[model samples]
Target: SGAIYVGNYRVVNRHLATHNDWANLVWEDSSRDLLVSSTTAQGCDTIARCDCQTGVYYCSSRRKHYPVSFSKPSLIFVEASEYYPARYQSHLMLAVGHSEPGDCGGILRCQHGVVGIVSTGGNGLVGFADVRDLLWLDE
Candidate 1:
């Protein structure tokens, strides 16, 4: 179930700092950017990057639990994917809930009429914002 995530900044704002120029971008046939960091602590490191030169985050998506929001105006996945391959992200889709329990009584609808993969924890679809700016922070 999607819950309310706090903060005015997009969930990945802190992760994509000045040290790294990589940032998830989104455009239409001429632009791109995005993110969906996990809220848990579990990963296979060596912390993969797409290109040795480029620094973007792109890795796992599945998790046990996730934090979401509707009133907050903005909320993103805590998962950090700082270097996904170029072709790996062919497309993406982000689903934003309408309101508490959702307008359809919690019926998941594609954000702005878009669609994403809704399995268990959450859902995702086409590649809207690129996940090449997020960094996996190991604590």
Candidate 2:
């Protein structure tokens, strides 16, 4: 039941997090292009598995690509917990100039590799869920 087809991509499974709006679609084909993560940020950094210091990043949507940069890891309140009260949700902030709801699930990449997945955005700020955490769920 986890397997699904997204366009031509055969996704074997989906890894969704309970704490964030991020999820990873596991593709079945291994021949697809793979972006390797930078060694330094792969395990060294805490906030973002990629180099947060370097703001160089990019995302493509609807045949158009745009340059974006890392803003920061922002903490926002989420109404997930009822009796427990509100909880803070952490999101990787990006300085994406303009985006649309159609751009959701777009891949955010840097010179290092795929860093995050587009989730939500507003007012020139877009939030992405850490790709490292999503990939970890594959195991």
Candidate 3:
């Protein structure tokens, strides 16, 4: 019911040995110059996995038992298709939360803010980093 997502942006780190260079051409107006991926995964393949092409994950805002984060940031969707073809429905709003306890951190605004689309997963927004980058894993 709020702003629908036109698409999402993923910051391009060294996860990929080299940038594909296709994301820049695909998501032209995203303006982040990062690698774009999808969030639409169920169980088998996830966005974190590098088994796909675009790399961006494909996900939805609603799920089996949860609700859509109308006010929170989420995957891009269209409410009115007045100019859907040209991608004019790109007014995006985002919301961020803490990661799972041992994962990263935690979110404390759930007095009413939306969580995600899973039993115990997902954040209001996809890839807007609020803190500094600290890499612990070695490639």
Residue 42 Cα positional deviation in candidate 2, in Å, after optimal superposition: 20
Over 1-139, each residue of candidate 1 has an lDDT whose tens digit, in order, gives: 2211112112222222222212432111211222233333333322222322211111133322232321211133323244322332223323332122111101122222111212112233211232222342222
TM-score for candidate 1, residues paired by index = 0.18
CA shift at 68, candidate 3, in angstroms?
6.8
By the lDDT metric, which is better: model 1 or model 2?
2
- Per-residue lDDT over 1-139 for candidate 3, one digit per residue giving the tens place of the 0 to 100 score: 1111112322231112134434343222232112333333222211221111111111333311221232323334423322223222222323343222122112111222222111112454433211111121111
Rank candidates, lDDT, best first: 2, 1, 3
Specify the highest-lDDT model's number.
2
lDDT of each: 0.24, 0.41, 0.24
What's the true lDDT of residue 1 in model 3? 10
User: 1-139 in candidate 2: lDDT tens per residue?
Assistant: 1111122222221222122212332322111111222111223222235555333332344455566766665665434322224455464455656554545556556665555556555576665544444344222
Candidate 2's TM-score: 0.47
